[PDB]
Amino acid sequence: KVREYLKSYSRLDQAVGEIDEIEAQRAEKS
Amino acid sequence: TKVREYLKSYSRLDQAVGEIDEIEAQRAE
Amino acid sequence: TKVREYLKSYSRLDQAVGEIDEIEAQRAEK
Amino acid sequence: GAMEDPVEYPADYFRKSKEIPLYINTTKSLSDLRGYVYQGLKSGNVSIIHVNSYLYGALKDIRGKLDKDWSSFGINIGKAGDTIGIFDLVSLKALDGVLPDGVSDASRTSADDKWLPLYLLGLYRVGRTQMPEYRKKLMDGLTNQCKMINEQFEPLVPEGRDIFDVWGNDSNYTKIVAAVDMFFHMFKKHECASFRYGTIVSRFKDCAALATFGHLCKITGMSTEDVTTWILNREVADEMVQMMLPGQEIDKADSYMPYLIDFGLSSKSPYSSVKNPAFHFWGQLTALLLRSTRARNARQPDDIEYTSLTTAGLLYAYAVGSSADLAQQFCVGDNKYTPDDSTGGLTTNAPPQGRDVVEWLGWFEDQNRKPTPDMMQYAKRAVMSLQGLREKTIGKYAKSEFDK
Amino acid sequence: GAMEDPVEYPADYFRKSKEIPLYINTTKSLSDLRGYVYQGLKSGNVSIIHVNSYLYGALKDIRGKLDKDWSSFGINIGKAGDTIGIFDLVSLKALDGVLPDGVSDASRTSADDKWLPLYLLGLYRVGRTQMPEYRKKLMDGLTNQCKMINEQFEPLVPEGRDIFDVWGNDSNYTKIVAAVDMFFHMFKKHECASFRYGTIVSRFKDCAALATFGHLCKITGMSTEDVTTWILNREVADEMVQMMLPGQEIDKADSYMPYLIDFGLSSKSPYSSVKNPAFHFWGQLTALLLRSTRARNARQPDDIEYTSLTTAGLLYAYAVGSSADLAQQFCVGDNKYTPDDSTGGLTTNAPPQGRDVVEWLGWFEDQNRKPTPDMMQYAKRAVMSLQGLREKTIGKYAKSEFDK
Amino acid sequence: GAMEDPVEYPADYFRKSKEIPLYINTTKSLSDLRGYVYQGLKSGNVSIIHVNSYLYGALKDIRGKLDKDWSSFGINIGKAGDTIGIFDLVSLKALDGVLPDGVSDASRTSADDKWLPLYLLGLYRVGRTQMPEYRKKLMDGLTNQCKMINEQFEPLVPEGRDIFDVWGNDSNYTKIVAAVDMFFHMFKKHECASFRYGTIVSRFKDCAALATFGHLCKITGMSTEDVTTWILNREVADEMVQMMLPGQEIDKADSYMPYLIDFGLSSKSPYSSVKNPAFHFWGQLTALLLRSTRARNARQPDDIEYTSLTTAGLLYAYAVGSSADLAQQFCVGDNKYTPDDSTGGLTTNAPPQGRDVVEWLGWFEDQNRKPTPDMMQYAKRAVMSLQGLREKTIGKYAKSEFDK
């Protein structure tokens, strides 16, 4: 319905994967 | 029909009622 | 996806990887 | 209503009086009053007259510069670049004679007065919860809040508590609570905005039907107008008209209306769940069937039309459930989805493709106005899995109704 | 976000101010502050101002030489081959007048300072954790980290534990935490890079929706672009644009943006799960159906379209699960695989072979926009065998939904 | 790669340095260093400085005559037939500041020197295990290995044991470990070859994916070449290329290659399971379905395409499982078996005879790219009967996936 745009973020795919790595470290268990 | 929908004064009702539920959410045990 | 292939430069690779797994079997815990 | 039930609208209050009177009694000075309240809490007995008087003396921070004009129900609280205080929202005083109690003179002028008003105003929220397991969570949270203003504060009031439970019944105490909350709602970035920890429950107090109305919109993803068209019971509609009466500023965030109870603007809230029992029941039941985590613990109203409200709740929840309107939101330029649909299924017995109440009503008439097996199966699957249901709640009702 | 929720962006902070003020107070001798901190921790109570004033003085190493320029949001931190310290990322000093505490004169100018700042900054990570069994895991890691700097280090802080949990509320403490992490992100090979043990959690703090966006991209094996096309709900789409607003340096590894909360650049995060509840629910549910071991514990948000977001999540998960796109990657020369045999399945019924949103949307029409008995199976088979699920989690919701 | 995680290759260290610098401590006699180490161990506290210094002094046996040239990464360790020692694989010596500790001078200048180095180096392998049950098994074996040299040996260090775990974090200690192992890998028949009881775990440390690759080859009985053809996922393929980068001496038995981490040649190993998680999951899953007894405890990686990798592993394991490829190996003269009769079977539904990836990819296409009932049954029989599986292990995943 609306057109996709890079939105100035060309290293976005690499960045979001790095964010989840740090997020996994802050996961509390037991 | 008892009456037809009239946008009663409160044009910003949709944003308002959701904010009321946010505060009601903080009252649960 | 699309295909690529190369014969590995190592050759003695088949003997090597089997030996690496032998040492790996020794660090496993019970 | 009819008897003691006649609802009181916040707008009708300001036609009688142009001021909310806060009876701040006696001037014994801030230093004396601090000793009373500080030790009174430690001891386990403090006069509310002292607590009120101290809270006034400590909270006269005439800070906060106004951004735009502030007016509610024709009461001009401030204009453009005015500098107002917390008690500019109210007015008055009425001194007389007072009681004696315990006092500490070791209490410092500036040190105690930063964290203590937060502790007193915070006890309003604590003393209004019943179940002890959750009272401690709020208590420890209040302690954590005072440890931010710091000095390693430890709860002054002992395990006896109860002393602050009756505070919410004092009309002047609630007026300070409502004044603090209305003030820091306008001044969000104020140094003492953390004081809203306990005063927050004063906002939209006893307005649970408007909260129910807002909850149903969020769960269904439908607008207020669209939710309104899905009302199929007249008692609910009569209650809706009661709620949506013009001139009440219910969509105005900077208003006196969210504190109709605590400022004393209303004796009977037109927005309470007890005043809108058909809308509350129906709205929460529909929400629960659409997987609400909170609707299960909602109270079950008395003296209402259960069978009709349940059937309308089922038809609504079944409509929202079956018709999850999924459409493409983003695309790679050119490859776009357009539903040529054909907009037709299995004859007269195929459910409507949208959420038009008119289309669903006609389909329901063709079903002989009886909930279908799939309709009953939708509700059964929603209610089963609900564990730990409390008696006399919409959650427990729904399980007994459908889990068969 | 209308009220309270108005999202504040990292870039908007630098429109107003060109510096991050670090209020380091008193600034009075490292030897004295080391005695304050050492004995303070060991005693069971230490002033945050002392911790701050010590942390500054112990971390003034102008170490690390840039081989490439340093700039974010118009702020030029370093140019070419400049040697900078951890505090070139911040500004200022603001003496006030301190207060007494327990001191050790036996403390060392040599022995301490090489592990003590690491011990203090590590208490930041331990304090944020709540589950007591997991608190020990980080504490023991911290014990080891300092024991790696000799001394047979033994934890200074007793089991009181109350003191360092409140540290995360100090405006200046968290700024040093952000300065340390940001600095040793640029110089990850630096001698004092280990100081990032406790400061790593300051990076991308309160940015769970961007982490969710990353999680989903990994589990599906799709690009950010391709995932975005599979968004079928409007609220998720609206929240996606909010996250993807240009000029916020969200893809820049060397930026101020990850520490927007701890630097005080943003009061309300755009990338928080709370501000993106629809995307977080949809993203985490889809990921869980696709065999995620972390998605089960994800927080189930309130006031969202549970029913509708579930249908979009199921279709997306069913598309990935049914289309495991397997193809040759290596061949022994000549013997290659080229597909496209038939590619036309069982009449109208066969599901698409690719993962094209449009084809699956068209297929969904043919199924009358109702989850297939096979679709319900796929999700049922993914949610069963899940054990030890907690209340109000995506895991508990998903199992209650599809397992019956 | 991209950020912080970029892989470092063995060969790229030797481009910038021709030395592996071992910083050996302040020179203070073998006899004196014996006393520090002996007493320090049984007392409960000994400096790694003293441990490293003693290890250098005791292990200076220049007893190893080369039978062939010695070369790794352009470094000529030795030529023709010259005699070398353990520390010809390293360089250097660095002083700092020494520290007082408990000593015993009753220790024999010769007798203790035969078993003590084995004991100190053996504690390296002991400190790498978390599980106390298996941790004792290594300790018992270390005691028995030292009992072989000296009859009257009793374990020195008390039950505290958390002393030697920190040694693995010392750069110089791990260099001695790696130098000892590389020496006795060459001189297997040497008198002091027993010293490898604890140093063996330095070999191929953090090279788990190469072991995974080796495992899959042994379990399927297929060549490295044939296993590579059975890769049907692009991420696995990308990781394989990363592992198979030329000129890293990964097939070279005698190289600096296996001791990547301990020698300080790489901070991020390209052969780890962490950096090759898709290959690890898929490789270990396929192995498990093919009756691997070790694969059920393999760590389940995060942020990978479980759905795709599972289908790829299943097709592969089902191919190996279906095609046993039984052929006559020995004939008793004249009476032979020629498999020429029957090369094709029943329908588009019969699986291929051999293990050609292109043949199974074609067959998989004709089964609609969905695992068949029998294909799902093979996996069910291969996972049920697995008892006592940990969380986040390949075994738990496989049973939870296929046992229904």
Residue numbers in the entry:
A (entry chain N): 6 to 35
B (entry chain O): 5 to 33
C (entry chain Q): 5 to 34
D (entry chain D), E (entry chain E), F (entry chain C): 19 to 422
Please quote the authors directly:
In this study, we report the reconstitution of complexes between a recombinant N of VSV lacking the 21 N-terminal residues, NΔ21, and either full-length P dimer or a peptide encompassing the N0-binding MoRE of P, named here P60, that comprises the first 60 amino acids of P, a two-amino acid linker and a C-terminal His6-tag. The complex contained no RNA, but instead, in each protomer, residues 6 to 35 of P60 were visible in a groove formed by residues of the hinge region of N (aa 200–300) at the junction between NNTD and NCTD. The MoRE of VSV P (aa 6–35) binds to the central hinge region of N mainly through hydrophobic interactions. The amphipathic α-helix of P, together with residues 14 to 16, inserts into a hydrophobic groove of N. Tyr14 perfectly fits into a small hydrophobic pocket. In addition, the complex is stabilized by three intermolecular salt bridges. Concomitantly, the other extremity of the MoRE (aa 6–13) docks in a shallow groove on the backside of the N protomer which, in the multimeric N-RNA complex, is occupied by the NNT-arm of the adjacent Ni−1 protomer and whose bottom is made up of the NCT-loop of the Ni+1 protomer. N, the N-terminal part of the MoRE of P will compete with the NNT-arm of a neighboring N molecule and therefore interferes with the polymerization of N in the absence of RNA. 0-P60 complex, the negative pole of P localizes in the RNA binding groove, while the positive pole docks on the backside of NCTD, modifying the distribution of electrostatic potentials on these surfaces of N and suggesting that electrostatics could play a role in orientating P before binding.
For non-segmented (−)RNA viruses of the Rhabdoviridae and Paramyxoviridae, N is assisted by the viral phosphoprotein (P). P binds to nascent RNA-free N, forming a N0-P complex (the superscript 0 denotes the absence of RNA) that prevents the polymerization of N and the non-specific encapsidation of host cell RNAs.
